[PDB]
Amino acid sequence: PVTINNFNYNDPIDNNNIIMMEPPFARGTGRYYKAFKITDRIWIIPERYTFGYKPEDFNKSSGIFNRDVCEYYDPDYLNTNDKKNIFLQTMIKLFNRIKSKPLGEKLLEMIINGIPYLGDRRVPLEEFNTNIASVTVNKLISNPGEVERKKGIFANLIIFGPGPVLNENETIDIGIQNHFASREGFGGIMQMKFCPEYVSVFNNVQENKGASIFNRRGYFSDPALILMHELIHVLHGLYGIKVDDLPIVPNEKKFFMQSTDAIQAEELYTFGGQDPSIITPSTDKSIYDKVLQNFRGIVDRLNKVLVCISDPNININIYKNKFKDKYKFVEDSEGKYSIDVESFDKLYKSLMFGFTETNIAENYKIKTRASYFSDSLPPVKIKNLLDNEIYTIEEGFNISDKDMEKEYRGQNKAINKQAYEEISKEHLAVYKIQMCKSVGICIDVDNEDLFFIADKNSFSDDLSKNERIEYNTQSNYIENDFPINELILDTDLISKIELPSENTESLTDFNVDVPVYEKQPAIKKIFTDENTIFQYLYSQTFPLDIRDISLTSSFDDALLFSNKVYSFFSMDYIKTANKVVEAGLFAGWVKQIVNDFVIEANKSNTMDKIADISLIVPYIGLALNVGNETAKGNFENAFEIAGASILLEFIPELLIPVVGAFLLESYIDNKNKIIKTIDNALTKRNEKWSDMYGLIVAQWLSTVNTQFYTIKEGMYKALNYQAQALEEIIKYRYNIYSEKEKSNINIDFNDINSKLNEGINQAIDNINNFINGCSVSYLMKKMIPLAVEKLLDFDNTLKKNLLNYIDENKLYLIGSAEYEKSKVNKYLKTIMPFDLSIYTNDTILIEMFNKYNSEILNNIILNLRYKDNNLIDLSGYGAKVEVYDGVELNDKNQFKLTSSANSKIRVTQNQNIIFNSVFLDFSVSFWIRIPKYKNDGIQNYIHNEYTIINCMKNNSGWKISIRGNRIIWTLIDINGKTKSVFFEYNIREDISEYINRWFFVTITNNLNNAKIYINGKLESNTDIKDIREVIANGEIIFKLDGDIDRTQFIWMKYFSIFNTELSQSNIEERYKIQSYSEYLKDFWGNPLMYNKEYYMFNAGNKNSYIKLKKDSPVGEILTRSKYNQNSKYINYRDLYIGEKFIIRRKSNSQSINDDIVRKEDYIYLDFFNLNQEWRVYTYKYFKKEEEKLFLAPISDSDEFYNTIQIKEYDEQPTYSCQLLFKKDEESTDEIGLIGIHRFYESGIVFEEYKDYFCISKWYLKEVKRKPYNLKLGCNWQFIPKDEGWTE
């Protein structure tokens, strides 16, 4: 077990556990430091770390040491014995807390036992040299006032107090002659600068910190975790694996890019969590190999070490046994040490992926920042770590007795204020970028708030190198994971070999490199007239010396005037917010504007389903003007067009290497070796794909996802400024009143704040979901495809390479050069589907990915929509769309294909989309309007089949075609095998619901079936089991092709494709979504229009029509005439019959030209009687429950109702609509609905029943029933003349 020692600063020096040490960087000169051995090989020096610093640097200046830390200064820390002792007692408490759990004890045990090798690169393989500054440190044995006598000792860790910046903890290693033993397998004395009172503060993004912007927000760190984070560095340094490699460097070419030090993989491994995924698998292996090579040199030394000149006392055997166990080397019967691959593997992973800040936090139930790449807030001072009421060895701050265990309450700044103090800002220093405009006017932005964008150079191009494939060659994958459970239960990790005595010969060679630090400007001034995220966020603030402000939608006035603040909320919200009222109305106004704030913020949940976008936060553009000037125009629209890319401040230049060639080595006459090779080249091929994916993930995380992070924070800040501004205004208006009035004003400022804060949290959640959605979108559509492209090119190049190989050895393969010839094709046929979870196990990142893949709309690989008189693909995959001259396009997304050759659309699909799922799994949806057959051309109509959409590549693919009243879907696999499914509508109906009328089509394909849906309902099915591979990513041609009549045309709308089979539910939903409109429709399915002649149709009496009765002002109902010719294939009822009606608008006299009819509009229903325009009327005073409508010339009579409100009571899609007569617009008094009534007529001559055009109250209740009665006599449809229908 581990034993923590105990002592007080004032305890006497005994030259054993309390000594006068001579620190490595002292170079054998200068005074000594009283040091205490807290545990074996570990020392604590309770004093400021001054090595490499200037005495003045300890004071706060206009400089800074690190560009990414809100630095705290206080040169008095540790300036008295009592302060030192407190430092000591605190370190002791922390070490005890660390060992309070297995995982911590083991980390400590590994460190104590991980003694530095005796020597470094300069030392001969046969020697042990303790006389170097990385192995031995001295202690002054003689009395005070003279360095006369000194003894050398071995040591693993020396922990000092903090350097200039107290909250800037760092673990330091020893360099000698430009080299580091702690980076080359040896390990070396580690040093640390640590401060336990002043800890970091972090605030979880997707999470709330007490859920309230008005209270302190965030969480403070458990110093024990901060210490264990440093200890992990020590561990790495002690085992000599703290190696360097290709780092993550930030791009600093643009002014909005965050500037900072290069981040080594060793750092990200130490943090754990998602950070390791920012290190490409390529670089993971580079490091792996470097460490393994270091261990080989050390293991070779153990087989050659013979003596130790520096210290005649060193027992050669004892150390050989210690290092053998330290490095987990395998000995052998003779004493020959060698490396065991399994054991090495386990040790390496334990050190780089087991002991991580992330794993230790989860284990000690301590909260920490979600990622290394997270904004850094101001640090706080812990009041008293030595007070068990605030901090305990067992639980830290999260004490269950104080009910501070759940949700890390003890670390919550808004909840555990009795545990910490805020810091005096006048002691903090941060690196800022002073953004100035060319005039002058400047805004300060903390470097921390900028976008961190990894530069291209941060990534390895090892994928572009060639590789030799031999019967040997095997695949190599490094797991950035490690089961902490086995690590904690591991029985051999922790050594049980004697720890050598720490006493040895004094160090005489003080040669060592000592770092030199120095501050740099805390402010860097740049020039830019750009008004991006920083300026926009600024426009939303106001000086502390101003209390009277007014909101404005004008960004420019907001910057110009200090009393004007910018707001991205609605114009109505801004006017109300600036409204000044009487004290007697203040309360009302407060509730009103606060309620508005919530509604405005709540718009973050806006849907845009018609555009195949479930979530959109319309105001993000106005809020930050981030990326491609998203503050101009309509964001939603600009988003539907370019998508997530428009939100990025910068489009990274990705590194996507041309995968190196495979040099295959052949073995003549060997049936086994030659084969083994091929198989290995196959598996190695997979390592290439995976490695390419990891390369992408790493770039996505450090160049893209970081930008979206900055945007999420930007919105949290923007929404916050808005709440505070409203807070300011309210405070100001209230305080204008007298105390007498305030007493009678009913306001609860805590309720106002509670509601404002709630609306914000609700918005933050939407924004987070939205933004994470975008980020994953960019990964899958803008990054994965560019990689798939290369990998596919590599495959082909490898395909021939392998065949040509199975070719040259066709001899030494005899009757098998074939069995594998295919093996190569069938293998390079199936590709590896991307899976983010393979490159990371971070829960948040996985949920983002799964959430994305569960949204059916992300399966759209083509979506042709209209934009600026043209069709473009808005799927996000960038298909090229060529629309030729013979195609007609309207802004209602309708496109017409005619008989002319130039009436076609060429679509070149994206070749890099995993479409070939290996069984055929995709859907196609679209609306179509197919004209009626010409009566004089029925024969050709039912006989000639013609293609309309063709997608073929290598005589394989799919096709949509038409033959008369039948639409057909056809599949053709690579073998030329064909399967079809079709939907044919009847052409002998009095009234067809399809002929020349818009309707929704949906075709789905899965391994077994090809199904066709019409208007959401399944119509046909075809077993497609035999069909083999079908190539569907070929070019798509929209064009009427076949033996068609010159007049033959076709209308289509919303053509889209999904790389998956849609369910009956997804389809029914798409039908409803695409059917929706504010306006009503006409019989054909087009928008109902004002001032357009229409014949009237009645869904409750199909074959009936209205006619003005000869002798009376009523409309009789006659039977529609039918198809007179003699064909046996056709039958219908005339539609161009009866009166010709025309809908007139009731309000705003903007003339009588045209316009769309919208639900609930008030109209006049007129019609033409010869050369005059008449109107439909209702006698106001009828007592019966229905009467004949009154048709007569246009006139104003107080005895007749002439105003109609066009309605839509059906909740499901329909082209029918209803006509309601109301007393007047305002009145809720309903007269009745227009329909048809049968009356009995008995005259001196004729006795019969006759139907008339009527109004009736009966329908009022009928239209409320569910499901909606489509047969009701009050359901009408308007039919206008249409080239698609001739009778």
Ligand SMILES: COc1cccc2c1C(=O)c1c(O)c3c(c(O)c1C2=O)C[C@@](O)(C(=O)CO)C[C@@H]3O[C@H]1C[C@H](N)[C@H](O)[C@H](C)O1
């Ligand atoms: C126990 O039934 C009733 C009791 C009291 C009042 C009522 C009714 C009633 O059944 C009823 C109706 O069925 C209808 C109407 C109605 O007003 C009432 C009552 O007031 C109105 C209607 O005739 C229209 O002209 C619509 O524009 C439609 C409908 O008539 C049906 C039957 C008619 N004879 C005719 O066949 C018509 C075409 O359909």
Ligand SMILES: [Zn+2]
């Ligand atoms: Zn670190």
